[PDB]
Structure formats: C-alpha cells, structure tokens
Design a protein around this ligand. Structure first.
Ligand code: CA
Ligand code: CA
Ligand code: CA
Ligand code: CA
Ligand code: CA
Ligand code: CA
Lengths: 255, 256, 256, 256, 256, 255
C-alpha cells in the first residue's frame, strides 16, 4: 500500500513506478519516503537481483513540490536534514536501473543519476532548473552531473537551467543507452533481467567496486578492487560460472 | 585603463576582452595581472552577476610570450611562483563564461578551462602544444583537460601537441556549447545575461557546489552541497524565487 | 627470450606485441610477467622514448586464461597478490600507447586502459564480460573504465557484460583516436615516433602530471603541476625548446 | 524493552548503559542493534542534547562474542554486511560521550572510539587483542586508533595485542580526560550536562565540522567549516548567544 | 603605520605584535586585514627569512570582537566571506612562528594554529569557547585543532569550551615547545633567527612539503616531497650547503 | 654476501643490522639497495613472519653520504628518481620493526618511520637536520614525521634541525615504546617473536588495514577494513585461533 508509487515483482526484477501523473511525477517528501522504503525492501529480498525505477512516457519526474520548501528556514532544513533520506537509495546494494522517458528535471534528474544504470528513451529531457527558484541542487546534482558530463556542461545546465536532450546526454556521459520511446520499458526490463540472472554477490561486488571510483584516489580504488577480486574466489558462484562457460551452457547461480 | 585587455559593463554583465592583436592574444605576465585584476574588481561589484572572457574572431589566446620564460632558472620560477596569480581567476565567486573563437592554445586553452562555462565558435581550435618547447602545461592543463576529456585524449593532446576542433571538444567534455562563429559573442552575451539575472546568491552557491566535485570524495561533495542547499533557505531570494513560481509571476531578486 | 610476446625497437620506439594467437592473445601470469619485464627494460633504456603495446588484427587481447583462476583459494590469492604485478606497467615513466585492433575484452580492455594513449582500429571491441562467469575485474577495470566513460556506461558494461564498439568508445572517453584497421600499426608508429622525438624529460613530466589528475584534489594537482613546471626550467630541453621557437628553427633535444 | 542495555534520561542527557555483566559487557549482534536503536531514538528526541554510552566499573566492554563469528562463511558475512549497523552510531548528530571504566578491549575499544568525547577512569585498559585469535578489527579499530595515536603505537597494539593503560591513552590522543574510577560517572554526567545545555544547533554543527577533519583535505575542511559557520548566523542561538555575551548575562538558548 | 599591530624588522626576522591591549588582543576585521597585509609584505621581502606573530604577556589573543558579528545574517556573512582573508596568512611562503603567552582563545587559538611553529609560554592557555556564544569555530579550529590533538580532545575542547594549559597542549600535539614565560620572546627570536639563517629556498620547500601532509594521501605526499627534493638540486644553496658540510666550513647561502 | 648490512634469521624473525660503524651507519645508495633487497627476500620467505631493522648502540643511522648528492643536478636526480627505491621497504607486506638506539637522524629518522613498529632505546635521538645542508627531507620525513607528531613539532624539527629525545618522541606519537638501552634488542626480538607467531595472513591484513588510515577518507578506510574483516573468515587460521582460545592453549597457525 503506497500512495505515490507502484511496485511490481517479475522473476528477479523489482520495478518501482512513480505514480503522480497529474503532477508530472514531481517529487515530494512522500515520494522520497515511499521510493526509499520500497527500494530498501527490494534490496533485502533474496529473490530480487535488479531494481528498476521509472515514471511515465511524459515524465520520469518533472521537478519537485515547491510548497513543501517555500516557507523553510535554514533551521527547519538543517533540523530535518532535508533530502538526506534519498541517501537510502544510493545505499541500496542491488543494482538499480533508471528507465527515463520524457522530463527528468531537477530532483527527477538527480533521482536518475543516483541509480547505477540509466536507460533513456529518445524523448528524455534532462535539466537542473531550480536556480530559477533561487536555490541550487539539493539531491546531489552538482556532484553527480558534474562527474558524469564534465564541468563545462554541468555549469551550463546548473547556472542557466537549460535542458539537455537524450543525444547530448548520451555523448556526454550521463546515460548508459538511448532507445526508442516505445521500447524503453522492454529494453529496461531486458537489461534488468540480464543483471538479475548474474550471481547476486558478483553483481553487488562489481557495483561496489565501480562506486569506489568516486570516493578515493585511483591507487586506493585499484587496491580495493583487487582485494574484492580475490574474495570473489571464496564464493561458489565463480566455480559454477566457469563450469557453464566451459560446457557452453547458461549458468545456474545460487546467489 | 589596461594595456592588454578591454573591459566593458552592460547591465549585470562584465566583459573582459583580450587585446594583444599583434600577438594573437598570446598570454604574458601583464595579461595575467590585468585579467585577474579586472575579474576581481567585477567580482566585488554587486551590479555584476556574470563575467565573460573572450578574445578576437582569430584567437581567444594563441599560446604565451616565450621570451618571458626562455631564460628562467628553476630558482627564478620558484621565487616568482610563476603563473600562480592565475589562481585569482579560479577564486572569482561570480560565474565566468569563456567565449572562445579561433585559437585557444597552451595557456589560452588553460585560461578557457579556468572559466565555469565555455561557449565555443565552430572555428575554435584547442591544444596544449608546449611539449614541443620542452615543457609541460603550467596553468593547470594537465589537471583540467584530463578531468574534462579523460586520460586517453588528454595524454594524446599533451604528448603530441595535436589540435582538437570544436566538434571533438564538445563531444569529449571540454565545451558547454558550440555555436556558429558569427553568433559567438551574441550567444555568450545571451548566456551571461541569463546567468546574471538569476539570484546572485543562488548562482554563487551553485558554482561553488559544482567546483567541489573536483576537490573531494563524492560522499563529502554530497554533504557539502546539501548543507549549502540548507543555507539557501536563509536567503531572501529562495523565498522570493519559490513564491514567484507558486504565484505564477516573475521573481524580483535582490541578491541576498 | 620471451615465450608469449615479441619485442621490437625502431629508433626511439619500442613495440611489445602480444603473441598468443592460439588463445586470441588471452592474458595469463606468463604474459603479465613478460610484458611488465619488457616494458620495464624499455623504460630504463635511454634510447627509447615511447612504448607501443599491441596484439593482432583479430584481438588486442580477448580476456584472461580461466584455468589459473579456478585453481586457487583466497589465502592463496592474497599471498600471491594475484594480478598485482600488472602495476609495474603503470609505473613505467616513458609514454605508453595501446594500439588496439579487434577484441580487447576483460583483462584485455584493462591492459589497454593502463596505457597512456589508446589508438583504436575501427574494428576494436571493448568490454568487461567476466561478470558472466561470476568473476570481477582484477586489473583495474572498475576504476579506469568508470573514470574514462562515466558511471552510467561503466555500470552498464560491467554489470551486463555488453561490448562497446570503437565509435562509442571514442565519443565516451575511452580512446584517443579511431583509425581504419589497415592503418592502425602505421598510425600507432607515427604517434609513437612523434612522442619519442619530444624531450624525454618534458614527456615524462607531462605524463606524470596528467596521472596526478586521478590521485588527489584538483587543488593539489594544480600545485603539483606548477612545481613540476617550475622544475622544467632547470632542464636543458626547456632552454633549447624555447630558444628554437624564438629563433624559428627545429629544436635539437638532448633529453636532459 | 531492551535485553542487553539500560537507557536513562536526566534532563537533556540520555545514558545508554551496557548490561551484560555475565559476559563483561561483550558486544554481539543484539547489543549492536539495541545500542544503535536507542542512540537513534535519543538522537531524534529534541529534549536530548547529549548521549553517554557506558558499561560497568569492571568493563566498558571486554570484546565481542566469539560464537557469532565462527558460525558464518564469507558470502554470508558479505550478504549480512556483518558489523555494518554500528555505522548508525557514527551517524548520530547529537554529541556522544563514552565513559570508559576497566576493560575496553577489541570491539569495546572500537565502540569507545566511535563516540565524540571519551572520558576514561584511571582503571581503563584499552586494546585490540583479537589478532591473537587470528581475527581482525571489524568496527573501525584499524582506522580510528591509527588516527588517534599514530602509526607506531597503533601498529604495536594491533599486531601484538598489548593493552594500553589510561595514562598512555591520554598522552597518546585516544582519550579526552582521565578521572578517578569512583568519579567517572559523576564527571561524565557533568560533561554531558555542560554539552547538553549548549545550543543544540551549535553543538551539532561543531561536531559535524570536527568530523570533517578525517574525511577530506585540510583545504576542503576549512571551507566546509567556514560555510557552516556562516550558516550559524541564520540561527536564533547565534543571535542570543552573542547578545548575552555583550550584555553580560547568561544566554537563554532555544535550540533553533 | 598600523592601528592594531606593531611591526619590527631585525636582520632577517620580522615580528608582528598584536596591539589591542584594551581588549587583550581580541581579533577583529581590522586585525585580520593588518596582520595579513603585514605578513604578505614581509613574505615578499627578500631580506626576511622568518616571521614571528605574538601578543602580550597577558594574551596572545583573547577571542574576538563580538559586536562585529552579533547582528550578522547568513547573507551578510556569505557575501563578506567572513574570515576568508585569514587564508592569506596560511598562504605565506616564509616560515611563521607563533609566540604564545597567556590567553590564546577562540580566534586567538586558531591564529596560533595557522602558524608553522608554535612556541608557548608556560603561562599559555588555549581554548575554543565560542560554542558558548552559539557558534562553532570559524577560523579553522575544528580542522587544525583536531588534526593536532586528535578527535577526543578536540571534541572535548570545542563542545565544552574548556581551556587547555601549556603542559597538556605540548603533550597533545598543539605546541612545538614550552618555555618559561620570561623567556618566551627570547626563545621565539632565537628560533626565528635560526630559521632565517637557513637557505630561504630550502626553508620554503620544507614548509611547503610539511603542509602537503594535510592535503592528500600519504602516497601523493611522498611523491610531492621527493620531486620537490629533486628540484632542490637545481639550487645554488643545495650545492653550497653540501659543499660547506663536506669542506668543514660555514655555508654562505644566497637564497637561490 | 652484503657489504653494508648483516642479515640473520632466528625462527620466524629476520633481523637486518646496518653495518657501517665508522660512518655511524650513515645511509648511502648501497645501503638502500642492500636493505631493500634483504627486506624483499625476507618478505617472500614463508618461514619469516617479522622483520627487524636496527643499527648500533651509538647510531641506528646518522644521516647520509653527502658526497653522493653534492654534485647532483635536478636532471640527475629526476632521471635517477633518487631515493625512490626506498619505497620497496614500505611495500614489504610482512610486519617490520625498527629497533632504534642512539642517532636516527635525517635519512635514518626516515628509515625508522617507514617501518610499522618503532621500539626506541632511551638513548634514541631523532632529527631531520638536512635543512642545514640546503635541502629538505627526501625519504618521506616531511610526510611521516608530520603525520606522527603533528604540524607544530614537525615544523620545528624540520625548519631548525633540532633533535628530539626518546621521551618527547614517545609522548608525541613517533615511537611505539621506549625501553632501556641495554634491553633494546631483547625487547625488539620479543615483540618480533610475538608478531611472527600470529597468523601470517592475519598480521599482513591488519598491517594493510592500518596503512589505509593514511591513504583515504575515514569513510573509505572503514569500508576497506570491514571487507578485509569479512575475508579473514575465509581462512583456516581464524578457526584454529578460536579453538586455541576456547581450550586455553597456544594456537598453532599454519599461516
Ligand atoms: Ca563524451
Ligand atoms: Ca526561507
Ligand atoms: Ca632554464
Ligand atoms: Ca544572525
Ligand atoms: Ca601525544
Ligand atoms: Ca646541484
């Protein structure tokens, strides 16, 4: 029973769909709490190996509920640690896939960037326009956008509020793949299926290793990866993976 | 009255134009001192919300004055802290826009990369060729180029001295937008106007937050941004910006 | 005498060619030891200024031998520090160029990423497919890929095992330049020649500076580069390089 | 209802007392879940301004239960992320004080180090002896000990398993203050009272700033602190605190 | 002619003496501007090799002028970048020595910590008490105190406002040496003289290298130091220093 | 056959003793090469679990051979990467113990700081005096001294060249323990014996974890430690360690 989202399970794939169509899936505190609660529940479910987050064909998530912020003081925001709960999504250990159609603006752009894989429809429009409302990004946009697309384009988007289409996003580093709008959900599901049929521990360790690339020097990331790599050979799925390859068959991992 | 640059102010936009046409705007010590002095002055002017740096249609800046460096010893360079003063431009709090036409080579490329936004003419040509003079980049090119375009291309440019055209620069991460050469100054001024009409507080905070992305772990950058975002709720412009949006009217920012 | 590679010297260019056609140039512990040994020997040779690593037209390197990995436990892997020796290649001070044709998959992709410059044939195919075997990258793939092409694409490649063609690799940050397959070795030799004819001191310093971009804050990288730049003024090649420019002649470098 | 701890509230001070005398307050998964749950609940209570964690006169906490650790494999440890939940204690925003009497060994030493302030009885004994069981620190001991007392002493403690008495701990960086054993709880309550009667906003900001000192370069830490300091001028307690000082009266804080 | 400080030069030693005796040398905006201006001027003087900052026998500096802060909004503080100018003292390349007698509280403690060497009178009293005024440290105390004395003691000082005497400061990491109060200025001048008679290049490099220890990983700091050390071999003072040692004579440094 | 050092093995302890008594064990290129070669050989020997480095009662190592540096140009030093080979000592995976009596000055101070554990005789005198020779530390002193004893004291030592006695070094963070001069070698051997009788892999992992505390943020060090911790339970020695404790006997690790 969620009020702002829909959750479905199909095999080892969980799908969270934002469900505020009249508001173009704009994020509010309720969406934050529901999305993070569902994602965390899915993350702890051993029968789920990949999580998709998506919106509608018109909008993945177009901005935020401004009435919830308009009257905040610094003290209000600091005491609430406003938006901190979104960190629960980045903390999810299972691979997450943002399937982005139409508007992914402000908080919606930031939500997409929090996921590991980002599959965009050719209709995807990305932006961080809230400078127009007298504030800066507050859900990590200044950090993740910049790391994805570089300073020049991040500054342009964040200081002007201009939109970036799917093609620009794909050649700039923001998205994994662009697909036709009509195929977005099919393609996202296909990718989620592939990832969910990997070893759960291997896919988690791989994700963890990639995430280290933003948290330390290359020298420390290399050491971390190697130690993780060594540990993957303390697992049963590695031996099954190698058997399947030799026998030219599909692996049957126990996760 | 500067010797090597021209400075103009219109509304909330300041424009610094490199002006050594006899040398295709090659950078020297005087250009460094004047550009930084002018940018710092504009930064402290409350009636300026954006700063453009640009050169000519032939060259943003084509390298450096080599005679100023040819005879230097290590002691000379270390004592002078040669090039350190360019750090004053990075320290400017107001958003800066590089409008790059023609050659942006060596120091010129590094100057363009110091700015926040980079709008390039389709004529723009970028490079870091001073390996051919027996030195490496000294104005941050090895750091900013690599972060913008990745190791493989940065190494290629820096070790071979090859130029990169505007199309390659744009798909590689170095430039914000490419526009036709005839429209460069018009487009740059339009972008600067847009930025200068934003809340000065919000724009300063947004720029500062973006800059943190290169200075610490993602985890620390995220905390910094969130706290700066919380601070924004103590500003008049946060209240007015959101009120104006809710009330379907134009915001009247006061820059506080 | 090497069993798995060939080593050639042409003027100031060394070329290491992977030579296991029976295994599509799959890497193993022997290839690791031989490549790193050869590269280190070339690195210490004052008559070499650039090093090319390459495979065949069909494969740069298609992966790693499975046999070796299934054989050991964790305490054994930890005690052997399996794959750590590849770090010797990153420690090479002389510029390195990967000339990649055909498959560069898994360890092969990782090897190419260890080099400074990466020139790809239009036939090149990159990827990290070993997740399909329940096996993680152990040669820096999770680190260098992510830093080259960004999180979204790196997560996609590493979690799904999909390949990336040359055009995508070029527009994403992974490769320096794409050239026709028939021209790969010619183009790589030309690039290596160009780099090897630069000042050895300037090239080494430039490479070292670029590498700093992944190891510290931008602020520290800028300081490191500026100080290395200052040191360059103690070198003969700085003096000659700049004198030659001013006097309109070809520089005559001594690599000092 | 807790099984392994007691929780008390006295004005603005919360006190969590480890209560497993039969095991010298050895930590286990149940103690981890209960301590973190209690601390989080206290952290979210606006009527609490400081949190004390303490054990008995004989032991703060003598280690961790061996039973739980021998029970699992690696894939199980990784899937459970064994000990990760202790991170909730580090995430507490309200100031925390460890009042340590007697044994604080292994996980017990690590728990004390997670707190902001550490007041030690003269009877306190610290150490990381689990290397003797072939077991590594898993609660941050290799990180916090080293940062507190330096490499030489941390390597000594962690590799040999030797204990460190209160005097050595105080002169080495591990503890805030040493007091007589009979006075520990009185002194800890007095310190907690003092902290809890400060502005809740100022105390939280100060703690957060100090914590930054271990997460980034000094340059970034200085910037973070200065900006948090700037934000403090949006708080009522800054206004009242400074007004009270100027008017020579006791400040009357509202924790806003 | 400064208002809040006195400046004296003798041989290669400059001395800045805080001079607000009516306020026990409490820091205000004017002190910040004058101290930084004077230090920057001394830094650029080739006949100065060391800079002392000191106050009176009663107080190095006892806090700050609170009236200047009491009425500030966040916007006021952010726009002013309140306290940022103190960064100019950290940017001084010449070695700085704080000679601390009596109270060094709040900003005064932070000022002492900005210097390279800290010589304390046995009368010295350190603290960071502005939590009692509803704010946290704003001049780097949360960063430098914590790095000097460790988390437990820094948290204790900053959250309670308690003072730390010279003995505790010296065994905790905050001060270089403690001397009798009557000998403080004599000892500070002797230390400054010793430092000022070293090669100015070598002393600048040594200080810069030490400062890197707080800005990056150990691995990066080690590379930086080694490269700066290599650069030293381009200096006349390296040649003369080592020649003088080998030849059993006094070095004649030229500061290049 | 070494010219400047002596190497002995006793059970699982290797001992490297600097042997240039007429020069107060001053470091030169030969000592660097011999010490690093012996340490690396000992590190690869499965019958060695701890390595001691020591000098004489008068001097652990008093400075360096200045004639080897006096005539160097920047180009010479950069081309040689002068002193880089000392990095081989820090790269040793087995625990290293510096047993320091008398002078440990300049390079000798730096050599002591490169080791993991530092046991000092009460006669130990530490210093970094080479500012007097117109250079700064070149073997990591500016990095390791500062991290050990704090800025104020590191700056004092490095800018003035003053010496620091054993008592000051011990209360400042530089040394693990101070013992009487007559007991230095006995105490160092005792400590080395203790460490060498731990599980080889556990002692290596513990050392590795501690070393991370200087290479990244606390958040990243904590993650690294936990993953390492999890991996220690993929080893046989852990189970033996726990059996021995329960049975109140000495463990018999297989390393
Ligand atoms: Ca791109
Ligand atoms: Ca507000
Ligand atoms: Ca020169
Ligand atoms: Ca106020
Ligand atoms: Ca101490
Ligand atoms: Ca020389």
């Amino acid at each position: 029973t969620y009020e702002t989202i829909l959750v479905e399970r199909d095999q080892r794939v969980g799908i969270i769909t934002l469900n505020r169509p009249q508001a173009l899936n704009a994020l509010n505190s309720q969406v934050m709490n529901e999305v993070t609660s569902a994602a965390t529940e899915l993350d702890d479910d051993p029968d789920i190996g990949a999580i998709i987050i998506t919106g509608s064909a018109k909008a993945f998530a177009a901005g935020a509920d401004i009435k919830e912020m308009a009257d905040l003081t610094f003290a209000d925001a600091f005491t609430a640690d406003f938006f901190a709960t979104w960190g629960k999504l980045a903390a999810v250990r299972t691979p997450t896939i943002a399937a982005v159609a139409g508007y992914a603006l402000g908080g919606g752009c930031e939500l997409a960037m929090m996921c590991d894989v980002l599959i965009a429809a050719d209709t995807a429009k990305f932006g961080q326009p809230e400078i127009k409302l007298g504030v800066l990004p507050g859900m990590g946009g200044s950090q993740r956008l910049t790391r994805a697309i570089g300073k020049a384009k991040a500054m342009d988007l964040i200081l002007t509020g201009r939109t970036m289409d799917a093609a620009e996003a794909e050649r700039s580093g923001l998205v994994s793949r662009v697909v036709p709008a009509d195929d977005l959900l099919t393609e996202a599901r296909a990718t989620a299926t592939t990832i969910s049929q990997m070893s759960a521990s291997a896919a988690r360790m791989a994700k963890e290793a990639v995430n280290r690339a933003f948290e330390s020097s290359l020298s420390e990331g290399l050491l971390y990866e190697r130690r993780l790599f060594h540990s993957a050979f303390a697992t049963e799925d590695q031996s099954e993976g190698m058997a399947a390859f030799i026998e030219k068959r599909a692996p049957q991992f126990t996760h």
